[PDB]
Ligand binder design. Structure first.
Ligand SMILES: C[C@@](O)(C(=O)O)c1ccccc1
Ligand SMILES: C[C@@](O)(C(=O)O)c1ccccc1
Ligand SMILES: C[C@@](O)(C(=O)O)c1ccccc1
Ligand SMILES: C[C@@](O)(C(=O)O)c1ccccc1
Ligand SMILES: [Mg+2]
Ligand SMILES: [Mg+2]
Ligand SMILES: [Mg+2]
Ligand SMILES: [Mg+2]
Lengths: 357, 357, 357, 357
């Protein structure tokens, strides 16, 4: 009855409100692929993908353009659709870019399904909208900018911020954390992210020092694929190890959880497999007793977390703000799902034109 | 926006088309509780519960009548509803009758949600209807009746039947299986169910003898709660051990799968937690690499299996046929989801009146 | 020779001497089912069941009334009786309400058996009465009431109290514990109960802070069915994790102990399976090296603990005091078994009439 | 001293000498990306990539074109190069297409390094050329074509063939194997590949039946990422389970071997990480006691296997034969490394022009 009738993609490089500082340099734009899924019902589903680096941008888009053929004229049944794609890409490898691409389609399919039924996604999922606590996500900023950004966050009502650490010396790491703490007060949450930058022993050493500072969590201390190493680090800490942003599919999540690699999880709506993947991941998290946060995709994550039994935090990091309407709002540090069919993603066409690649 | 406005239950004892023969005697009726969930939208959700024994019938109904208060005036958000109930019953114990009761409400909530959206449940779930292979479910019938019933099944187009075994002597067990095989032919599926009747060593001995006969699976050889014993039995067999009908919630399923207690699973829509529980169970099954079949509740199971990544068999066992319209049909041994909003459960009011308890 | 001749049940809502404060509100009554088991010998056995919530009260009673038939005219052989019931309810699920019901019958059967032999239960069990140290059980009371109640306990001679914690903030938790400690002195026992209210990481964090305060034990930090989570929490602590109140049967206890989920146990005479279940549980506790305390049912628990090899504490919490004679006494913080045949439960009929439901 | 000066890629769809038959249909072409790595020394390194499906072809090429920038002006030090890329793609995910791309560069870098030193790759690797036993790789051909192809193989001197199985019915599987055996004789090797097509229980059942036929190995019985499932299947067999073609990097291989998922391995030079990845994989295989075969890339695999301590079989499957010189030869079923610097890959430019995409 409801069919998929077309797929259109547009590659853009959009300005970032909060320039991300790295050891490498300063990056003020994000490589995104915007997706429009047309249907026989007159509704158009929308999603976006994050490419991480501009090196992968055009390849991503082209990959989508080339997959369009397999999905056109198929029913708008996201679950059935995902299984078909999993089977089409089983030799090539259903992971990495291919998996990211499929996830973009899933997310758009689900947004369209919500439009057909005139209902917010969260409601289609069987749950009620609820406000979700969010933390403001910052970067490898230095003591001055880090504290600054943290003070503003608090001013805007957030009760937690995340900072990137992993300086050449541990003492720099500690300097950042201390200055934030001194400025925001003793309760406030301070999450730290190492971005896979340390080896196991270094991780244990730096982390035990942070643990004494009072951090909320320690995120991705070592190489993401090294589940066993994360487990070793975790085993020497009281503070929780957080991870999950790099899991491609619930099957990677399953592996990591099976060995007790972490005490917290934070899947990425895109890497986990879209709405379909998230729902699977949320069941795993519940069973393993793991509090589940989100990574990127703030708009859809708000919906997804409201339906998650072990929902923990929402990551505030606005990637697509320059080309979308501001329907998701933050009131007293909690994200508010807009009362709009689907995900509530509405393009700012005029702006898109500016960033086109 | 859409609220739950009332709950009405009716306890009945309905005639069974296929009298179930047991070691105890012959039982021709089923103790069921029929549920009607009213909503602010004008739609009425429907489900039924199976009480197993008439000893538990009135208690079940009364338990529902007493819970009505906690759900009335709550939004029709099955996922949110389940979490609320899990928290209300956490001291008393969210399992057994209480859990069965909550599952009845879940199933009705989901049927109503489908009505509000004018869509079949399977579609609301994100999948397409597909035909599901079914097996005809029989009892501890004796050689004559067992073969008879099996011949009729084949005549009606089924490609598999399940028989109950567990006679005083192994040789009786084998006599039943052989006569069926001789009558239906070498391909046909023959599933056997021990109904928790043996001890571990007996189980291993009888099962190895059956394995040589050519059975499809060996179901519940020993006490259901003994996961470790099932694992021991499984470890000495090539044929698959099947289990799951007695798991109360996905958390029991998780325990059993964690220790490799079986190679097949067959949750009961009621005991697993309704639609909400099934969806969770299906994610677990996928991750552990377990083919998932259903137990009872044929009407809703047809929908649920179409959305299950590792869907295996549908159990044909008509409990409520005397008081419901025949919307689910069997065409060439596969179950066909009716094209009707919700689950497609429609009462035969006039008949209900007859069976009322 | 001695037969069971009848079963009569009465549902009551009795006033509580110590109103239990919860996050929800104040509850001053308990939903109980009082049981009378008649025999051919002229003796009448007595027990009671706790329903937790009034939502389950009528269902419980009705369930008992409906089981009466299976037990009448059966010999007064509690062990044989339990096995029969386990087999009758094997499809429906021998757990939850059904199991609680069976346990009520067990307890009454054992009380009657003691009457037939004119001997206190403890003696029928092969042991001598001994005084058992008890702790006074309080609730989520706030700093003021908590300290108050604790001072009175000490005044009455108790050497330990249990308080419920799990406030929105850890610091509230600590405030309660500190004020009690300050008031009762440094030796006194302070047991804390989280009532399944935290997630694993929160549990580890709060518990390590309490451990520094000097608490006796940490009870049910997370969801009761999550044995593996309890093990994780336990693994990061020196203080003992206590659990067991929610185990339905010794088979659940066996599972939890098998994975080292706790260092202390505290089965509930009702949930564990009555006298028959307790005796089994006590053997397990001995073998696993676990000190065993009781949960509720103070009257019978006094007898049961005197026969328990690893007996630890008796929980003083008077549920049925308003409708029973005060035969169990407390002398210098130890419970004294009354010298009376059976359990020494004697109804205050006139009061019962008042609370009838 | 020796620098990388440029990267040129060409996407082609080349005819296959042996049309691969699938359940889907007949495919007579291969989507390949041909790579030319220019250097400051005047030498040009060559490699090719296999895209599996034409859906991924253009995306692959574009991805390479976009990475060219990061490698140009870098020294020709394949080991150092790989580490740089691993670090550049750590957020995006160093797996899937990105990893395949990097592997193409590695292979070309190593071919160029051999050219600079005027030596065959195998010799640069520290080993001597040796002839490697090869098996002729066929498809899901049917009884007639399968036997035919097998008879020709034997005629050309091969001592083993691989066939694809996984028919709707087991009996079809067995029919293929039997007819081959009957035609080639009792010694001859018959390898079978299920191509991830079965579930665990089906896998165990079909495999035990094959094991009785006398097959050389059972390849990829179930989903590639399910290491644990492969282990279960392996555990019920004497015949070896073979796997490895889908491992992306030695880190995936490490995971699978750690749990004993198989008794044989067969990494793909491209998916494993090129020359650099293969060398790492070969050390793992040696330590775990695993015989190591190759998957695709026959030209380079000949070199790689000669340097592999546990070398087992070379897979003969000519993907790029239409656009390259025939320097690798087969003499009496063994592959002979050509005596030519590098890998000995020489384009047939005139033919390339024909297949360009
Ligand atoms: C640093 C990060 O890992 C995070 O979680 O914030 C991140 C990863 C990828 C893109 C943006 C941010
Ligand atoms: C025998 C049974 O276990 C089955 O699976 O068929 C069954 C159990 C409970 C009610 C009816 C049938
Ligand atoms: C709080 C509690 O868990 C305890 O152990 O005291 C409790 C549980 C159930 C009823 C009363 C008290
Ligand atoms: C069937 C296969 O798995 C093999 O090993 O031969 C194969 C996989 C991918 C491309 C070609 C061949
Ligand atoms: Mg991160
Ligand atoms: Mg069964
Ligand atoms: Mg408690
Ligand atoms: Mg293969």
């Amino acid at each position: 009855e409801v069919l998929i009738t077309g797929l259109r993609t547009r590659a853009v490089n959009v300005p970032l409100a909060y320039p991300v500082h790295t050891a490498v340099g300063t990056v003020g734009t994000a490589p995104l692929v915007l997706i429009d899924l047309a249907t026989s019902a007159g509704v158009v589903g929308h999603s976006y993908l994050f490419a991480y680096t501009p090196v992968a941008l055009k390849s991503l888009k082209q990959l989508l353009d080339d997959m369009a053929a397999m999905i056109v004229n198929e029913p708008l049944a996201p679950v059935s659709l995902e299984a078909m794609l999993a089977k089409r890409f089983c030799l090539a490898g259903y992971t990495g870019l291919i998996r990211m691409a499929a996830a973009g389609i899933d997310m758009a399919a689900w947004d369209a399904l919500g439009k057909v039924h005139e209902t917010p996604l969260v409601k289609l999922l069987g749950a009620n909208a609820r406000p979700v606590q969010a933390y403001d996500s910052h970067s490898l900023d230095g003591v001055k900018l880090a504290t600054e950004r943290a003070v503003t966050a608090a001013e805007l009502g957030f009760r937690a911020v995340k900072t990137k650490i992993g300086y050449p010396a541990l003492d720099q790491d500690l300097a950042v954390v201390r200055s934030i703490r001194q400025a925001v007060g003793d309760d406030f949450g301070i999450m730290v992210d190492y971005n896979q930058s340390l080896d196991v022993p270094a991780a244990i050493k730096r982390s035990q020092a942070l643990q004494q500072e009072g951090v909320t969590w320690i995120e991705e201390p070592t190489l993401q694929h090294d589940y066993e190493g994360h487990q070793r680090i975790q085993s020497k800490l009281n503070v929780p190890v957080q991870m999950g942003e790099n899991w491609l599919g619930p099957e990677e999540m399953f592996k990591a959880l099976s060995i007790g690699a972490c005490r917290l999880a934070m899947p990425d709506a895109m890497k986990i497999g879209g709405v379909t993947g998230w729902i699977r991941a949320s069941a795993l998290a519940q069973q393993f007793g793991i509090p589940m946060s989100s990574h990127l995709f703030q708009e859809i994550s708000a919906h997804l977390l409201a339906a998650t039994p072990t929902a923990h935090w929402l990551q505030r990091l606005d990637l697509a703000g320059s080309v979308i309407e501001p329907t998701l709002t933050f009131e007293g540090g909690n994200a508010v799902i807009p009362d709009l069919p689907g995900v509530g993603i509405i393009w700012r066409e005029k702006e898109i034109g500016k960033y086109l690649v």
